[PDB]
Amino acid sequence: HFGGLKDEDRIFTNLYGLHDPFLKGAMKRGDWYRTKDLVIKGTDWIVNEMKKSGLRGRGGAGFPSGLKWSFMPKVSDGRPSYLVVNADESEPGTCKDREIMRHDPHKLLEGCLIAGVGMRATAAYIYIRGEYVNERKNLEKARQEAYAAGLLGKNACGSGYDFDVHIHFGAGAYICGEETALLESLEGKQGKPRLKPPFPANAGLYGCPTTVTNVETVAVSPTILRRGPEWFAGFGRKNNAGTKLFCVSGHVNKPCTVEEEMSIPLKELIERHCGGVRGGWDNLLAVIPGGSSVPLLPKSICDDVLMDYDALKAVQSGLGTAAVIVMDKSTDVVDAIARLSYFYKHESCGQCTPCREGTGWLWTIMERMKVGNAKLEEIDMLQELTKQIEGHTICALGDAAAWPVQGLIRHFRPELERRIRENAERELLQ
Amino acid sequence: TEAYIRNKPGMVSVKDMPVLQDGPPPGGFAPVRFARRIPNKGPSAVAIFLAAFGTFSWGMYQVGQGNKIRR
Numbered sequence: 159h160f161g162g163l164k165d166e167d168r169i170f171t172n173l174y175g176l177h178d179p180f181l182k183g184a185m186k187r188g189d190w191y192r193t194k195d196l197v198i199k200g201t202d203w204i205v206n207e208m209k210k211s212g213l214r215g216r217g218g219a220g221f222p223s224g225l226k227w228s229f230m231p232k233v234s235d236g237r238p239s240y241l242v243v244n245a246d247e248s249e250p251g252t253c254k255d256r257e258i259m260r261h262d263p264h265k266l267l268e269g270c271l272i273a274g275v276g277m278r279a280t281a282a283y284i285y286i287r288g289e290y291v292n293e294r295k296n297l298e299k300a301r302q303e304a305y306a307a308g309l310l311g312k313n314a315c316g317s318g319y320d321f322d323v324h325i326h327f328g329a330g331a332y333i334c335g336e337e338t339a340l341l342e343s344l345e346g347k348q349g350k351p352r353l354k355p356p357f358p359a360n361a362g363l364y365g366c367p368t369t370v371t372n373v374e375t376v377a378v379s380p381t382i383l384r385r386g387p388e389w390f391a392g393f394g395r396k397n398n399a400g401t402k403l404f405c406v407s408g409h410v411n412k413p414c415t416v417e418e419e420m421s422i423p424l425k426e427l428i429e430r431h432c433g434g435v436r437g438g439w440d441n442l443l444a445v446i447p448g449g450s451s452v453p454l455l456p457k458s459i460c461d462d463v464l465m466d467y468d469a470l471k472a473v474q475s476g477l478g479t480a481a482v483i484v485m486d487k488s489t490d491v492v493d494a495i496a497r498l499s500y501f502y503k504h505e506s507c508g509q510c511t512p513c514r515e516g517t518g519w520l521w522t523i524m525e526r527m528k529v530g531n532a533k534l535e536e537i538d539m540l541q542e543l544t545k546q547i548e549g550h551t552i553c554a555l556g557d558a559a560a561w562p563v564q565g566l567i568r569h570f571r572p573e574l575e576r577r578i579r580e581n582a583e584r585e586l587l588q
Numbered sequence: 589t590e591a592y593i594r595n596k597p598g599m600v601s602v603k604d605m606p607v608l609q610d611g612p613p614p615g616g617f618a619p620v621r622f623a624r625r626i627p628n629k630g631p632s633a634v635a636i637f638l639a640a641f642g643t644f645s646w647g648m649y650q651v652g653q654g655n656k657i658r659r
């Protein structure tokens with residue numbers, strides 16, 4: 159019912175980089191077509207188009223982009239206000255922003271200009287992760303090309319809007335992907351996220367009103383503006399609509415990143431574009447639908463689950479970055495989740511107690527339960543510790559660390575039961 | 589931790605932990621006779637009175653014979 163996008167309906171037409179990704183390729187593919195007219199149309203008009211386009215945040219939160227942009231102050235106060243574009247993707251399984259920046263950087267720049275115009279932002283900062291250095295060089299060259307051509311600067315186009323885009327790179331931190339942690343790191347401090355009595359739309363980058371927006375949303379902004387909000391709302395279903403690019407990785411035959419219509423069945427997504435599970439559909443054990451943050455799903459749910467915000471939320475999971483990591487019967491999901499917990503323990507900033515200590519405790523417990531050196535009441539205690547960590551931590555990385563363990567306990571509990579009983583029998587024998 | 593302190597070589601759950609405290613042996617000990625048992629198996633009152641009276645009579649007879657011999 160949903161899926162099967164055509165090449166004309168696909169937004170990122172250079173996803174694999176088979177054509178020139180620079181300005182000439184951008185003009186040939188249809189970038190910077192009527193940016194002057196789009197800017198002249200109006201900030202309120204752009205905000206209304208985003209609101210009625212059904213676009214939702216692609217960074218994992220899923221918040222409506224139009225409303226998030228409308229949260230900015232309308233009256234220009236003394237503070238200059240800022241746009242920030244989250245190119246710092248470090249959640250395991252997702253690499254969509256890497257491809258976007260590497261092969262369609264002019265789309266990203268035009269999106270930055272459009273978002274800044276629509277949110278009355280003086281300047282934009284693109285926060286690239288430190289690992290992406292070739293992508294950073296490509297984006298630097300694209301930005302220099304745009305500045306030379308006059309697409310950015312004092313006169314972005316025939317319009318009189320003042321806009322300057324700068325790019326700042328991190329130094330390899332996963333917490334820096336969070337909005338407030340990214341603002342703190344861009345200030346030159348440690349990547350420690352702030353609390354949320356001051357929202358970033360009120361006191362953000364330098365205490366000025368800033369808006370943190372994902373690369374995919376900001377890049378698809380000009381395309382949906384030029385092609386009509388109705389065209390974007392045609393794909394998908396209900397609230398969650400549009401075109402989302404999924405990275406299918408893991409034990410699939412031919413892992414790949416492909417842009418597809420929202421609300422496509424997960425099975426149809428896997429066995430049509432990617433190629434399918436390594437040993438057929440029956441070989442599939444568990445799929446993490448988003449990045450490592452969201453809980454996994456067993457083979458039973460993945461038969462009919464739909465890859466979108468709502469169905470994945472109708473089941474106890476989330477779309478997140480919509481990068482599916484599959485695991486067949488050959489691997490051990492307990493070890494996979496133990497490695498995920500180790501990653502979260504390593505990448506927690508360690509400012510707030512439930513995540514600084516709880517992530518390490520979860521990793522140690524998962525390492526113990528991988529071999530089977532635990533108890534039934536200890537897996538119950540692991541679930542209780544997950545609940546304790548979840549709701550009492552500064553940012554959503556506590557939730558991202560708690561969710562995979564909770565999902566593994568919910569779904570693959572008999573595996574842990576068998577491992578613990580087998581280890582108990584072996585200990586008794588020894 | 590209670591499980592760490594009372595760990596068993598081959599236990600899986602926190603239950604059935606090893607335990608050994610002072611208590612009854614299987615069978616619950618034996619009765620201890622809280623009551624009192626005082627048996628009165630002594631000579632009867634009439635028997636001792638008759639013994640005393642006969643002893644007095646025969647002794648007075650012996651006193652008479654001894655006094656006769658001494659006289």
Ligand SMILES: Cc1cc2nc3c(=O)[nH]c(=O)nc-3n(C[C@H](O)[C@H](O)[C@H](O)COP(=O)(O)O)c2cc1C
Binds near residue numbers: 248
């Ligand atoms: C642990 C953690 C990891 C995050 N990773 C990313 C990321 O890879 N990319 C991103 O754009 N935002 C990331 N964020 C921030 C949120 O996705 C945030 O909603 C986003 O920057 C703005 O939302 P948007 O999807 O509407 O643009 C992360 C947040 C947390 C707490």
Ligand code: SF4
Binds near residue numbers: 351508513556
């Ligand atoms: S939940 Fe706390 S410890 Fe984890 S990264 Fe966020 S602020 Fe740091």
